[PDB]
Amino acid sequence: APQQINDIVHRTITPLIEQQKIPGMAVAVIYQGKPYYFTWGYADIAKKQPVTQQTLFELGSVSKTFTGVLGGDAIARGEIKLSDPTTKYWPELTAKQWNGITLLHLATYTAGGLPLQVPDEVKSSSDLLRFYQNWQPAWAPGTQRLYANSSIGLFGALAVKPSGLSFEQAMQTRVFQPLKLNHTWINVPPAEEKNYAWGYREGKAVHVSPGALDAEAYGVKSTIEDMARWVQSNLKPLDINEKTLQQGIQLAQSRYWQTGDMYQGLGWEMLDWPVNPDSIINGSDNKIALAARPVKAITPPTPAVRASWVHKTGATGGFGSYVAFIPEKELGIVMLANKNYPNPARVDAAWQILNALQ
Ligand SMILES: *[B]([O])([O])[C][N]C(=O)/C(=N\OC([C])([C])C([O])=O)C1=[C]SC([N])=N1
């Protein structure tokens, strides 16, 4: 724990926790490929349980990075192709608006306006078929980007079908295990409950509620140690022994579309380093992050650019997370909190910290 890291982290995080009234928080700073941990406050205010390196946090949308990579792994295995139409893996989708909508589109939120949230009323697998069949695009495929759980979530569900495995089983076997993320779960087992932090929303303790496509779009829980390890894997996919997993990771960082100065990958979103902090900070605000925007296809997709600021925000009703790394610098950071505080404040803290380290 070099004093340099120690100092920036505390100079930055301390005012952050106090300004946003964050109950508990864990931070991992990956400097030169090595992880450094810091923890603050409570995992459970009522039971006086402190946040520790073993505490599980709801990752929220950061879960999409795992989905993008698992999907990339499927492509690498030859099981699916991003150019394949959605209907090849779901022949039941017969509504004409699906012609021309590929897995690339679902994966990158460019199908033409799929909503951010899957309606609450959608429960059964037939309830989901009905939803997609009736959904009407506001735009032609591959022309507009609208960040949505219903889009990349569907991608994740379809991507694992050829494997014959269930989404959780596929995730575990192909991503969590190889990478030794042994305290990362889609479903927290009873044995681990004691490490599961409570999220906080307006003073009330809450955990994520079951929902359609939840596992695929925002349902992973993890500890600061595993997330640090997840960052290390996306920083250096070459150190990864499983051939298809290594490719998948790289495929998740390929640049498929560009909007503003941001490029869409599979789950991960990227910008060229050096970046203008104002651009990632203001751009992380939902004002922009959830807004519908025109996208320029990158034909063909640019392979993962090492000099990139790669990141993803994440949130549930009671949690707020952020992951950002610069491959070229072997530099990264993970910020986990059991409070959904504003994205801009997250990115600003990560920026000050990482910028201070090169
Ligand atoms: B991801 O975290 O970017 C997607 N997030 C969500 O789907 C959830 N909340 O995001 C919104 C609704 C924009 C918010 O209020 O911040 C979400 C999933 S489960 C849950 N309770 N909230």
From Swiss-Prot:
Up-regulation conditions: Can be induced by beta-lactams. Expression is not up-regulated by the non-beta-lactam inhibitor, benzo(b)thiophene-2-boronic acid (BZBTH2B).
Effect after changing K64R: Lowers activity more than 2000-fold
Reported impact of E216K: Increases activity about 150-fold with respect to cefotaxime. Reduces activity about 5-fold with respect to cephalothin. Reduces thermodynamic stability
Reaction equations catalysed: a beta-lactam + H2O = a substituted beta-amino acid
One term of GO molecular function: beta-lactamase activity
GO cellular component terms, semicolon-separated: outer membrane-bounded periplasmic space
SUPFAM superfamilies listed in its UniProt record: beta-lactamase/transpeptidase-like
Effect of N286A: Reduces binding affinity of inhibitor compound 1 about 17-fold
Result for mutant: N149 to D/H: Lowers activity more than 1000-fold
Alphabetized UniProt keyword annotations: Antibiotic resistance, Hydrolase, Periplasm, Signal
Enzyme Commission identifier(s): 3.5.2.6
Subcellular location: Periplasm
Enzyme class per UniProt: hydrolase
Disulfide bonds: none
Keyword check for Cell membrane: no
Family statement: Belongs to the class-C beta-lactamase family.
Known partners and oligomeric status: Monomer.
Stated name of the protein: Beta-lactamase
Native source organism of the sequence: Escherichia coli (strain K12)
Gene of this entry: ampC
